[PDB]
Amino acid sequence: PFDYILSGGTVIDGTNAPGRLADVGVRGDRIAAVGDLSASSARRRIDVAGKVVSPGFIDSHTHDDNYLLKHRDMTPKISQGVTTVVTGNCGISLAPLAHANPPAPLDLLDEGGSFRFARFSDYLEALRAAPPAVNAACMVGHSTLRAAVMPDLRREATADEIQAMQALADDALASGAIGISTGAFYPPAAHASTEEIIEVCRPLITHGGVYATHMRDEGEHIVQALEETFRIGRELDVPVVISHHKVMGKLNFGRSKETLALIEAAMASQDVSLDAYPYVAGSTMLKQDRVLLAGRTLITWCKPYPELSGRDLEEIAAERGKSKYDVVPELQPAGAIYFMMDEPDVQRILAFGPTMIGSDGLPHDERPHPRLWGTFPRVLGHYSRDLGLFPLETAVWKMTGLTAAKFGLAERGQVQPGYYADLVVFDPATVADSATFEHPTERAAGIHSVYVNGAAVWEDQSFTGQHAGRVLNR
């Protein structure tokens, strides 16, 4: 007999096909059958009439590396329907690195002495011993490797350092990491050459993972940054994933037409993927960057002046008698939200066929960007239902089947017999993001229940206590 059947709802199976009325039966951690299951014995037959049963949402872009250890409930994500998170993005991974003062933006994962894992395998073992509520597909970050190997980061790596980093990256992949990410836009890796990146990532073709990247520039020189990314993909001969695609800065508004055309052309000759979050503001370390600081900038957290969390940088700067750009150093380390994107570009990028959905939530932030709590329902409700940017089955595919395919997560992302029972039951008419910039932690509406490996993790708007997540391998 099945453990339970979710009966009477509409199944949107993750393959980009219109929903159809069908029951979903689960036995243990697997979807046992899909269709009219009235004749199948089940210990429970749960009525979900009026709801949609879809695969669990896969968060293609997270910084949940440490949150998975400190807050196993993973409420910001499971409350949105997320069942799997991809970690270690933008060259930022929690492991391998033993340092009590890692360089920004690595501090985005730190809760104080969190960087204690000398080997990537030790990190994966900690997750397996005390599993989080969601599955974790983990990448190792090139900036973390630089911090672990290089005494001085303000220069290109020597052959010896490249070899040491490559050795760590190879060990991580062998241990279960699903790829390697970079973020040369940031200080720890700004001096890294394309050659250094390519050689450190050679283990990918051997162990079979993806190369994920926060491109070197996402504004005026985004074309050069895209070309560097495509070149790396060709030299390594592995799939590349472009993180949080956007065009930033007033002088670049509208250029998503140009960037998407370049990505589409590249996809015709090499393996390219991309993800994006559904908002017009980004968030990361507070940084002296003329473009990031050009628009409205809010502080998410601040070490030297904790009381500044939630404040407007323009006001802080004015009252300190300095420009926004000049006041930054005295406030570091800190985090911020930057309003430097345009709605038309965000919509174009989201609608572009291949674009997968990633929240880019920064879970440790005192006053976070709302994407942490509202990304997936914002795509299903606001964009699909209310704006008609894409039909619901395509919105679902963009956070399930497409993502599982690009990251190589076998037997996940689709409501198919034999696949893992990572599922979401949501109300299509009411699903919606509730989090706003003013109240960034409000729980999404319309998310009835969430299952991970067959176990309910979210029910009655609360974590069930089921730590059902698993460390995944590509």
**Closest CB to Zn ion belongs to which residue?**
214
Under the binding rule (CB under 5 A), the answer on residue 70 touching Zn ion is yes
What are the structure tokens assigned to 379, written together? 């795509």
Q: In this structure, are strands 447-452 and 423-426 parallel, antiparallel, or unpaired?
A: antiparallel
The answer to whether 142 is annotated as binding is no
What is the distance between the alpha carbons of residues 250 and 286, in angstroms, rounded to a whole number? 19
Under the binding rule (CB under 5 A), the answer on residue 232 touching Zn ion is no
Cβ distance to Zn ion smaller for residue 32 or 248: 248
What is the closest distance, in whole angstroms, from the C-beta atom of residue 163 to Zn ion in the complex? 12
The answer to whether 315 is annotated as binding is yes
What is the distance between the alpha carbons of residues 300 and 331, in angstroms, rounded to a whole number? 12
Under the binding rule (CB under 5 A), the answer on residue 237 touching Zn ion is yes
What is the closest distance, in whole angstroms, from the C-beta atom of residue 424 to Zn ion in the complex? 20
- Residue 175's H or E segment, with its range, is helix 159-175
The answer to whether 366 is annotated as binding is no
**465 CB neighbour count, 10 Å cutoff:** 10
Under the binding rule (CB under 5 A), the answer on residue 382 touching Zn ion is yes
Q: Which of 98, 100, 118, 174 binds Zn ion (CB under 5 A)?
A: 174
The answer to whether 244 is annotated as binding is yes
CB 203 within 8 A of CB 474: no
The answer to whether 467 is annotated as binding is yes
What is the distance between the alpha carbons of residues 342 and 68, in angstroms, rounded to a whole number? 32
Under the binding rule (CB under 5 A), the answer on residue 328 touching Zn ion is no
Stretch that binds Zn ion, among 12-20, 257-265, 439-447, 459-467 (CB under 5 A): 459-467
CA atoms within 13 A on the CB side of 284: 21
What is the closest distance, in whole angstroms, from the C-beta atom of residue 307 to Zn ion in the complex? 12
What is the distance between the alpha carbons of residues 254 and 251, in angstroms, rounded to a whole number? 9
Cβ distance to Zn ion smaller for residue 244 or 412: 244
Under the binding rule (CB under 5 A), the answer on residue 294 touching Zn ion is yes
DSSP 333: S
What is the closest distance, in whole angstroms, from the C-beta atom of residue 294 to Zn ion in the complex? 4
CB under 8 Å, gap of 24 or more: what pairs does 31-35 form? 31/415, 31/416, 31/417, 31/418, 31/419, 31/420, 31/421, 31/423, 32/2, 32/417, 33/2, 33/417, 34/415, 34/416, 34/417
Sign of CA dihedral 303, 304, 305, 310: negative
What is the closest distance, in whole angstroms, from the C-beta atom of residue 244 to Zn ion in the complex? 6
Under the binding rule (CB under 5 A), the answer on residue 78 touching Zn ion is no
Residue 203, amino acid? P
Binding-site annotation: residue ranges for Cu(2+)? 61, 63, 90, 360
Binding-site annotation: residue ranges for Zn(2+)? 61, 63, 71, 90, 111, 170, 195, 199, 207, 214, 237, 244, 315, 319, 360, 382, 386, 467
Binding-site annotation: residue ranges? 61, 63, 71, 90, 111, 170, 195, 199, 207, 214, 237, 244, 315, 319, 360, 382, 386, 467
Interface with Zn ion (CB under 5 A): 70, 89-90, 170, 174, 195, 199, 214, 237, 250, 294, 319, 360, 382, 386, 467
